[PDB]
């Protein structure tokens, strides 16, 4: 749960995001690659991708970091109310891709990342803050239609 003043912070620092989808997305996926090798095994599409350059220079990729941040922030314009938006995703990532949730905590993290990297001295500790909470919230409401699937 976040009180208005956080989604506010969170959909301030979505702007930025949205300036520039692609850009964002792309660097999100690399660091996710990057940091957690284990992560590219699940895409067949990029699990060929042996280097930062090939990925940096993939336009695919940067079209799914596109998809991605796209369905991330349909997701986090809701504002919380994002039951319809959020169970497709859930039962694709559990019944299809099998993405464990561990994997959500490490996009997280790399979301906040990649804010940092890209808006350094202007991703504050307010806004920070209100942005965890959401990808907190997101994650958790994942958690339970995992645990209802018994998918781990
Ligand atoms: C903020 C977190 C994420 C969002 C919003 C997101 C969103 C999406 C969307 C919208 C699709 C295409 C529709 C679908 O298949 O349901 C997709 C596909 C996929 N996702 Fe995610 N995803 C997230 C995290 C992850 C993570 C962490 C992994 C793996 C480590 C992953 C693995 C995949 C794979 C393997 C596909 C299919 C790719 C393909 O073959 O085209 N996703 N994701």
């Given at each position: 749960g976040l009180s208005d003043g956080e989604w506010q912070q969170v959909l301030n620092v979505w702007g930025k995001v949205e300036a520039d989808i692609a850009g964002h997305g792309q660097e999100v996926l690399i660091r996710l690659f990057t940091g957690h090798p284990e992560t590219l095994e699940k895409f067949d599409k990029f699990k060929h991708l042996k280097t930062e350059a090939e990925m940096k220079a993939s336009e695919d990729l940067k079209k799914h970091?596109?998809?991605?941040?796209?369905?991330?922030?349909?997701?986090?314009?809701?504002?919380?109310?994002?039951?319809?938006?959020?169970?497709?995703?859930?039962?694709?990532?559990?019944?299809?891709?099998?993405?464990?949730?561990?994997?959500?905590?490490?996009?997280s993290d790399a979301i906040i990342?990649?804010?940092?990297?890209?808006?350094?001295?202007?991703?504050?500790?307010?806004?920070?803050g209100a942005m965890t909470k959401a990808l907190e919230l997101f994650r958790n409401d994942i958690a339970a239609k995992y645990k209802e699937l018994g998918f781990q």
């Amino acid at each position: 749960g976040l009180s208005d003043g956080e989604w506010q912070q969170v959909l301030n620092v979505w702007g930025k995001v949205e300036a520039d989808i692609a850009g964002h997305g792309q660097e999100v996926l690399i660091r996710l690659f990057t940091g957690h090798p284990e992560t590219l095994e699940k895409f067949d599409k990029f699990k060929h991708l042996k280097t930062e350059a090939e990925m940096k220079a993939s336009e695919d990729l940067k079209k799914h970091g596109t998809v991605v941040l796209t369905a991330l922030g349909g997701i986090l314009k809701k504002k919380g109310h994002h039951e319809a938006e959020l169970k497709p995703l859930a039962q694709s990532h559990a019944t299809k891709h099998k993405i464990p949730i561990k994997y959500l905590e490490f996009i997280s993290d790399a979301i906040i990342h990649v804010l940092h990297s890209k808006h350094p001295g202007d991703f504050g500790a307010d806004a920070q803050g209100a942005m965890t909470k959401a990808l907190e919230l997101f994650r958790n409401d994942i958690a339970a239609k995992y645990k209802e699937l018994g998918f781990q």
